[PDB]
Amino acid sequence: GMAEVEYRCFVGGLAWATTDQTLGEAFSQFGEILDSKIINDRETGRSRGFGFVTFKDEKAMRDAIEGMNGQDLDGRNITVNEAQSR
What we know:
Radius of gyration: 12 Å
Helix content: 10-25%
Largest sheet: 4 strands, antiparallel
């Protein structure tokens, strides 16, 4: 709703059971999502413990960052921060 483009947010400190399915919808409650993917660990077959969330709007991303940073998502307090458009 100002600059419509990929707003990439970095979410680190997820749980190893955190799926992009659970990740996405959690952030869908805050803002417009375009993409939400968990970076998995190929080597062990786990998650890396972090993922990326793509917003459609800057503000939709902003609120989601402050609102999600610190709370729990899938059994871990998640750390959410600014990653800017990538």
